[PDB]
């Protein structure tokens, strides 16, 4: 029973590898040789945000690009006005340990998750004007690692028990459960069309998940180590995943294999966060050695280095219009870098 | 642009109120000390939290000693895979590691030693100081007195081992029991001392998990940790 299933699984894996090898007629690097390189990108810190006590693990951007949400491990969730460096909202957290925060595309709600396994959704449009817990999501056996908003009604969350779940916020019950992981799902990134999302886990594989169907269409196995962060290319056809093996890898959904590996010999430290610009030409990678690298997605060279953080860069976020980049690190500072 | 000025004034007033609340919270946060409790499933971590107080992912215990606020976090409904979320606890003041010593049969002590080694050797946990509690001394004493011993079979070095002179034995305790307890303590010390170059230090205590003074020990250890940090700050140590 076990022997036949394992042999059949190995044969299927070999068939998938052979198909991927057949598809790889020419690499991305070979095609992009005759492309004008971007050059050095001298981003500067236009704004610095102050008022975080503990380390800032995650941040999310608004669709309007005016407001951002930063999660900290002090028990405080802060909504920041990026232009004027003003704190729009300060929210006390029931659990001190919060690893993820999300901002709704409408802007009405803000949900944060942590080690308590409970995702808390806060309504910002309360008539009294004070922040309150709109709803609390229990029912995760693992730690909640990431959450993203499809809309006001439905939220997608990442958990530490190798599961991703879709929750209907009005009911408070999971709409669907994604249970195809063997490793802790560090993060998930929604596509712009919101039909599909990709999740990165500790099993060194990224999964493409269909929100309505509930099964994983594709499995990407090209990483040596744990996948800390996953991000989508702006069209939604490709995604880039950071990892602890100091390699960012770009995977294409239609190719169903890794198009490119972004690595440097001096860089051995792990990659906490990966984000994309509005064009997708530049891939922004956060690191453990206190700096963020701007990578040319076509040429696979380091376009720029952002060195303004005392402690390791936990999260990297890019606005939807692409105007500025907000970087959160463990030194309790949010630095905004503009090209 | 009168409306824009009014909106900016309202934002500044809101920011000022939020900053005042953050300053009060900052004072409370800086005054408070965060402790992470990590222990094995067979180990009596729940017994220690029950004494400390006198489906959720994490358990928080709030206690104050000598007008010093301590928040202790105990891992509850979590997966056995611990590497990603252990990084979150580097910012705390101390990690209280509890190990159960036994002398289905598995080498739990070696697993505990490996876990302590991993915590000590973790990149971001290099700053954190580990307070070590050796649980279940009564069980060790009963097992050694009975004459059947697992630690001797598991450890070849234990057989050719001498009790350290700096160690203080209780009068009621058997010499063999003291040798086993100090040997386990020395194994943790050898890992902590060899691995770490003075950035952080390991405090070992002998407990049966029914002990009133445990909280006091934690307080003393926490005070010592801050003192060592101050000594590190002014480049003494």
């Amino acid at each position, epitope marked *: 029973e076990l022997d036949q299933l*394992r042999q059949e699984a190995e044969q299927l*894996k070999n068939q998938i*590898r052979d198909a991927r090898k057949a598809c790889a007629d020419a690499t991305l690097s070979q095609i992009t040789n005759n492309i004008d390189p971007v050059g050095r990108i001298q981003m500067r810190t236009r704004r610095t945000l102050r008022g975080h006590l503990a380390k800032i693990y995650a941040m999310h951007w608004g669709t309007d690009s005016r407001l951002l949400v930063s999660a900290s491990q002090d028990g405080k969730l802060i909504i920041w006005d990026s232009y004027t460096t003003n704190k729009v909202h300060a929210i006390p957290l029931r659990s001190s340990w919060v690893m993820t925060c999300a901002y709704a595309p409408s802007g009405n709600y803000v949900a944060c998750g942590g080690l308590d396994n409970i995702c808390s959704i806060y309504n910002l449009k309360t008539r009294e004007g004070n922040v309150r817990v709109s709803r609390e999501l229990a029912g995760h056996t693992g730690y909640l690692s990431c959450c993203r908003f499809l809309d006001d009604n439905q939220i997608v969350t990442s958990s530490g028990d*190798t599961t991703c779940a879709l929750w209907d916020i009005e009911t408070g019950q999971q709409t669907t459960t994604f249970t195809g992981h*063997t*490793g802790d799902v560090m993060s998930l990134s929604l596509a712009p069309d919101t039909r599909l999302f990709v999740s990165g886990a*500790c*099993d*060194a*594989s990224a999964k493409l998940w269909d929100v309505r169907e509930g099964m994983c269409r594709q499995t990407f*196995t*090209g*990483h*040596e*180590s*744990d996948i800390n962060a996953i991000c989508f290319f702006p069209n939604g056809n490709a995604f880039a995943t950071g990892s*602890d*093996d*100091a390699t960012c890898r770009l995977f294409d959904l239609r190719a169903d294999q890794e198009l490119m590996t972004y690595s440097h010999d001096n860089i*051995i430290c*792990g990659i906490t966060s990966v984000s994309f610009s509005k064009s997708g030409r530049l891939l922004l990678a956060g690191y453990d050695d206190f700096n963020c690298n701007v990578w040319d997605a076509l040429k696979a060279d380091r376009a720029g280095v952002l060195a303004g953080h005392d402690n390791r860069v936990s999260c990297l976020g890019v606005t939807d219009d692409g105007m500025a980049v907000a970087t959160g690190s463990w030194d309790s500072f949010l630095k905004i870098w503009n090209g | 642009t009168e409306d824009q000025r009014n909106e900016e004034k309202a934002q500044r007033e809101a920011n000022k109120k939020i900053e005042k609340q953050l300053q009060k919270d900052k004072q409370v946060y800086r005054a408070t000390h965060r402790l992470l409790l990590l222990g094995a499933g067979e180990s009596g971590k729940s017994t220690i939290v029950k004494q400390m107080r006198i489906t959720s992912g994490i358990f928080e215990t709030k206690f104050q000693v000598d007008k010093v606020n301590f928040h202790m976090f105990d891992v509850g409904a979590q997966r*056995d*895979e*611990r*590497r990603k979320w*252990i990084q979150c606890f580097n910012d705390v003041t101390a990690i209280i590691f509890v190990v159960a010593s036994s002398s*289905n*049969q*598995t*080498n739990r002590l*070696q*697993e505990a030693l*490996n*876990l302590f*080694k*991993s*915590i000590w*050797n*973790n*990149r971001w*946990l290099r700053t954190i100081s580990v307070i070590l509690f050796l649980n279940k001394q009564d069980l060790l004493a009963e097992k050694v007195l009975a004459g059947k011993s697992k630690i001797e*079979d*598991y*450890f*070849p*070095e*234990f057989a050719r081992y001498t009790t350290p002179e700096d160690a203080t034995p209780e009068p009621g305790e058997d010499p063999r029991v003291t040798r086993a307890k100090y040997f386990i303590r020395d194994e943790f010390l050898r890992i902590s001392t060899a*691995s770490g170059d003075g950035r952080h230090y390991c405090y070992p205590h002998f407990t049966c998990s029914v002990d009133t003074e445990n909280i006091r020990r934690v307080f003393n250890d926490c005070r010592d940790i801050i003192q060592r940090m101050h000594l590190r700050q002014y480049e003494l140590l």
Partner: nanobody, 128 residues
């Protein structure tokens, strides 16, 4: 794709010498410290031995200390375990495991109930 395959095992008499070979695919072998973990029947996983990136620093469980030899060949991309003077307690499934991050000393989740960077393992049984 990270895959570890175990070669060798089966049935061994007590006192016999058994060599366990681990084949590594999908990662750079030199960057990772690697260890052997054994699961006895009806018992939990227990760490047996580890060898570092360079191979100079090697640590063993005391029960297997002086009895098992672990060597890593970077060029042949292979992990070798040498077993001699085996005991009836020694019978267990042997799993080949890799530390999760490169260039690091910590191994948090190598001994854990479901860990994705270990091989399927080969049954080793010792019969007197």
């Amino acid at each position: 794709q990270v895959q570890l395959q175990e070669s060798g095992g089966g049935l061994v008499q007590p006192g016999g010498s058994l060599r366990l070979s681990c084949a590594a695919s999908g990662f750079t072998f030199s960057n990772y410290k690697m260890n052997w973990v054994r699961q006895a029947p009806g018992k939990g996983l227990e760490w047996v031995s580890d060898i570092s990136q360079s191979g100079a620093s090697i640590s063993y469980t005391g029960s297997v200390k002086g009895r098992f030899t672990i060597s890593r060949d970077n060029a042949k991309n292979t992990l070798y375990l040498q077993m001699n003077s085996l005991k009836p307690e020694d019978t267990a499934v042997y799993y080949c495991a890799r530390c999760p991050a490169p260039f690091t000393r910590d191994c948090f989740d190598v001994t854990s109930t479901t860990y994705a960077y270990r091989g399927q393992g080969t049954q080793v049984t010792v019969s007197s």
